[PDB]
C-alpha cells in the first residue's frame, strides 16, 4: 500500500541544549510529503500468511508509526542479513520493561510474539519467545526500565500515534519517540510535533534490513481464527525511509523543536533555507543548493603514511646561536601537530596568520623549521612587526608570515655556573637586515671614525657579544629555545598534509569533496583538459574554481555544479499564501528539465515547473504563472512582465 506522509518526523539533531535559535543541520531526516507504506497485517496462518509485507530494506532510517492498541506491535527487528552473520538489534517491548538485547539471533521468516498472560514473572517475559531461534554471542544489552511502546494512558490514547525514528550513524543507534494522541477520526495528524530524544545504546553493526514485529494471542494455523477478534488480530505500521536532507529547525525557550522546513521541496522551502527564516516577504530571492542533497563526503587527503620528524627539529643536542639559524627543510611529511601539545609544555604557542588550533586539516607544501636561542627578555621580539635587539640585527620575520613561532625555557642545560659563552648575538651592524638572512660575517665594525683596519682597538669591537646565561639570573635572563616554523603554500603538489583519512572517489555523483582544503560541493566528472588551469589574472573575485587535481592519482577532475542554472524563486510572502513561482535564468523553455536535472528531485517540484504554463523570457523561462496580456502595477522584479500572480485573487 501507499499513502501520503504529512510533515512529521523531525527529531533533535544533536544533544547540545539550544533555545531561540535557527540551526540548519544536515542529518538523515524524513522528506516531507513522501510516499510511506500503509502496510496492514493479517492473522490465522503462521507459515506463509502471517502478515502482508515481507522484510523491508533498511537504507538510512525508518519512520515507524502505528495506531493500534492492546499492545499488538511490541518489537522492531534490525540487522544486516539476520542469519548468523552480524549482531541483530531486537527491541522487544514488554508489559513494563523493554529488552534492547543486541545479540546474535536466528530470526525465522515468520517472526511472531505470543501474548503472555499478566502474572508475576522473573522480571522478564522470556516465557513466550518464538521470534528468534538461538543466541550465542550477545553484545551490549541495555535494559532500560521505562516502557517503549506506550508512555501515558487516557481516553484519547486509542488514537495515539507511537512514532519512532531509527538511525545507526557511525557509533550510536539514535532512537526517538513522541507519544501524542491524534484528533478523533484521523490516521495521521496535521500538526508539526517533534520526537523527543531517547536511548542511544552504542553499537557499530550495520543495518540493511528492517522488520516490524507483531504479536498474536493464540495461533492454530487455520482460516477459522483469521479475523474473529479472539485468537486473531490485525494492525498497521507506517514505514518511511530517511534520505540525507537539510532541515532548518526552530527552537523554543524550553529547548523543543518547533515548526521546521523541508528545504528539499517546493521552491518556497529553498527560499526558507537561503534566508534562514520562516516568514519570507515579497521579493526575488536566489537559491543555490539543498535540492540535490549530496550523500557522500570524499576526503582523499594524504598519499603517504610516514610521520614527520618534528621532534628532530624541536629537541636536539644543542641549538646554534642567533647569528646562525639552522634551517631544516622538511618535505614529503604528515602534518600531525598533536605531538606539539603533549611534549614539554611551552611558554607561548603564538600562531600568527592561521588559527592556533585546527592545524591538522589545513595542508601546506613545504614546512621550514628554524632553531636558535635567545634570552627571556626578547622572546616576544621574534614576531611580525616587533623590533628590538634580535629583531634588528639578527633573525627576523616578515609582515606576511603564515607560520607559528614557538619558544620554551631552557635554563636547565643552556646555562652553566661558570658560563655558557658559546651563544652570541650581533649588535654592531651598519645597516638593517632583511627577513630570512644569515649574516655570518666576523669582521670588525667601525662607524664613528676612521676604520681600525681590523684591530678591535679604541671604539672598535667585535659584533658578537657573548651573553652567557647564568643560573643565578631571573626568568627574564634565562635562555629560551625558540623554533620558528614556516608554512609555505606554492603552486605545486602538496607533500605534507594533516592526518585526515582517505575515502572512495565517487564519480558522476553529487558529493562533498575536500581534497587539499578545497572545500567544494559539485559533481566530479572526467574532463579532457590537459593541465589544471591556474586562475591568477582576475583573482576570481566573484568566481570559484572549475577543476581540481586528485592527491592520490594524477587525474584531472572537473567540478560541475550539481543542480543550478540561476534559479530565483518568486513568492508573494508566506503571510499571503503558499503559491510559489520559479524562474530559471539562462534557459530556453526546452532545456530546463536537463538544466536543474528534473529527474531525481522531489515529486512536489516535478509538477511545479516542467512544461506547464511556460513563457519565454529574455532572462530565461518564467514557469509558474500565466502571461496575461493586460496591464498591472509594480510587482516583484522578475526581469520583464507584470503578468498573473497571487495579486487580485
Amino acid at each position, epitope marked *: 500500500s501507499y499513502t501520503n506522509s504529512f510533515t512529521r518526523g523531525v527529531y533533535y539533531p544533536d544533544k547540545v541544549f539550544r533555545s531561540s535559535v535557527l540551526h540548519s543541520t544536515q542529518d538523515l531526516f524524513l522528506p516531507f510529503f513522501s510516499n510511506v507504506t500503509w502496510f496492514h497485517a493479517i492473522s490465522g496462518t503462521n507459515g506463509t500468511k502471517r502478515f502482508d509485507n515481507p522484510v523491508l530494506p533498511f537504507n538510512d532510517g525508518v519512520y515507524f508509526a502505528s495506531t493500534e492498541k492492546s499492545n499488538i506491535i511490541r518489537g522492531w527487528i534490525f540487522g544486516t542479513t539476520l542469519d548468523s552473520k552480524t549482531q541483530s538489534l531486537l527491541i522487544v517491548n514488554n508489559a513494563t520493561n523493554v529488552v534492547i538485547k543486541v545479540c546474535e539471533f536466528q530470526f525465522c521468516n515468520d517472526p511472531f510474539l505470543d501474548v503472555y498472560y499478566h502474572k508475576n514473572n522473573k522480571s522478564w517475559m522470556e516465557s513466550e519467545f518464538r521470534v528468534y531461534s538461538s543466541a550465542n554471542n550477545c553484545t551490549f544489552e541495555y535494559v532500560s526500565q521505562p516502557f517503549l511502546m506506550d508512555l501515558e494512558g487516557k481516553q484519547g490514547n486509542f488514537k495515539n500515534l507511537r512514532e519512532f525514528v531509527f538511525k545507526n550513524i557511525d557509533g550510536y543507534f539514535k532512537i526517538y519517540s513522541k507519544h501524542t494522541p491524534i484528533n478523533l477520526g484521523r490516521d495521521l495528524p496535521q500538526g508539526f510535533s517533534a520526537l523527543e530524544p531517547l536511548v542511544d545504546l552504542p553499537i557499530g553493526i550495520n543495518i540493511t534490513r528492517f522488520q516490524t514485529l507483531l504479536a498474536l494471542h493464540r495461533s492454530y494455523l487455520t482460516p477459522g481464527d483469521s479475523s474473529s477478534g479472539w485468537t486473531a488480530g490485525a494492525a498497521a505500521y507506517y514505514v518511511g525511509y530517511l534520505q540525507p536532507r537539510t532541515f532548518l529547525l526552530k527552537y523554543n525557550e524550553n529547548g523543543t523543536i518547533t515548526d521546521a522546513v523541508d528545504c528539499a521541496l517546493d521552491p518556497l522551502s529553498e527560499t526558507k533555507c537561503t534566508l534562514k527564516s520562516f516568514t519570507v516577504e515579497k521579493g526575488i530571492y536566489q537559491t543555490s543548493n539543498f535540492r540535490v542533497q549530496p550523500t557522500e563526503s570524499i576526503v582523499r587527503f594524504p598519499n603517504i603514511t610516514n610521520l614527520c620528524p618534528f621532534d628532530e627539529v624541536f629537541n636536539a643536542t644543542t641549538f646554534a646561536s642567533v647569528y646562525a639559524w639552522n*634551517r631544516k*627543510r622538511i*618535505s614529503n611529511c604528515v602534518a600531525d601537530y598533536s605531538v606539539l601539545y603533549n611534549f614539554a609544555p611551552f611558554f607561548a604557542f603564538k600562531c600568527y*596568520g592561521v588559527s592556533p588550533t585546527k592545524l591538522n586539516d589545513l595542508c601546506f607544501t*613545504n614546512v*621550514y623549521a628554524d632553531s636558535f636561542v635567545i634570552r627571556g627578555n626578547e622572546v616576544s621580539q621574534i614576531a611580525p612587526g616587533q623590533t628590538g635587539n634580535i629583531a634588528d640585527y639578527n633573525y627576523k620575520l*616578515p609582515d*606576511d*608570515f*603564515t*607560520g607559528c613561532v614557538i619558544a620554551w625555557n631552557s635554563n636547565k642545560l643552556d646555562s652553566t655556573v661558570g658560563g655558557n659563552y658559546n651563544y652570541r648575538y650581533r649588535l654592531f651592524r651598519k645597516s638593517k637586515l*632583511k*627577513p*630570512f*638572512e644569515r649574516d655570518i660575517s666576523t669582521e670588525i665594525y667601525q662607524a664613528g671614525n676612521k676604520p681600525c683596519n681590523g684591530v678591535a682597538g679604541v671604539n672598535c669591537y667585535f659584533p658578537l657579544q657573548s651573553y652567557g646565561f647564568r643560573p643565578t639570573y631571573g626568568v627574564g635572563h634565562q635562555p629560551y629555545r625558540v623554533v620558528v616554523l*614556516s*608554512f*609555505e*603554500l*606554492l*603552486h*605545486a603538489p602538496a607533500t605534507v598534509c594533516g592526518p585526515k583519512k582517505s575515502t572512495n572517489l565517487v564519480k558522476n555523483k553529487c558529493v562533498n569533496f575536500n581534497f587539499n582544503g578545497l572545500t567544494g560541493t559539485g559533481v566530479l566528472t572526467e574532463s579532457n*583538459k*590537459k*593541465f589544471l*588551469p*591556474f*586562475q*591568477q*589574472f582576475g*583573482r576570481d573575485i566573484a568566481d570559484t574554481t572549475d577543476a581540481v587535481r586528485d592527491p592520490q592519482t*594524477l587525474e584531472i577532475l572537473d567540478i560541475t555544479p550539481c543542480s543550478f542554472g540561476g534559479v530565483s524563486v518568486i513568492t508573494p510572502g508566506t503571510n499571503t499564501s503558499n503559491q510559489v513561482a520559479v524562474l530559471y535564468q539562462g534557459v530556453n523553455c526546452t532545456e530546463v528539465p536537463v538544466a536543474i536535472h528534473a529527474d531525481q528531485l522531489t515529486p512536489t517540484w516535478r509538477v511545479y515547473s516542467t512544461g506547464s504554463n511556460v513563457f519565454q523570457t529574455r532572462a530565461g523561462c518564467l514557469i509558474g504563472a500565466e502571461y496575461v496580456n493586460n496591464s498591472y502595477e509594480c510587482d516583484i522584479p522578475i526581469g520583464a512582465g507584470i503578468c498573473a500572480s497571487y495579486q487580485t485573487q
Partner: nanobody
Amino acid sequence: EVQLVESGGGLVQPGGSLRLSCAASDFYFDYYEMSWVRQAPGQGLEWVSTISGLGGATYYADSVKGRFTISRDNSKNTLYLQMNSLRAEDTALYYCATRSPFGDYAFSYWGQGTLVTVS
C-alpha cells in the same frame, strides 16, 4: 613596483633549446618565490616551475619535469630558464612573475612576457 623585463628567445626550431632571461631591477626581497607562467593560444595559462625563496629548492611541473631546468642567482638579480627538447608542445607565451610564499596563490609581479614557438 619592480618591473620584470623578459628576454632570451622569440622563435626556435622543433627539437632545440634556448635559454631565456628574467632580470629584476628593484628586487630587494630575497624570499619571494619566482616562477614561470606559459599561456598558449587557445586554452588558458599553465605553470612551468617555481623556485623556493626561503631555501634553494626547485619544483617543476609534470610535462616539463625532466626536460626543463631552472637556476637562480641573487648576485646579478636575474632568473634563467632552460628549454631543452622543445619537440611539439612548447608553443606558448611564457611570463615571469613573482609572489610571496606566505599568502594567496595569486602573483604580485606580473611581467611583460616573451613568446616561444617551435614549428
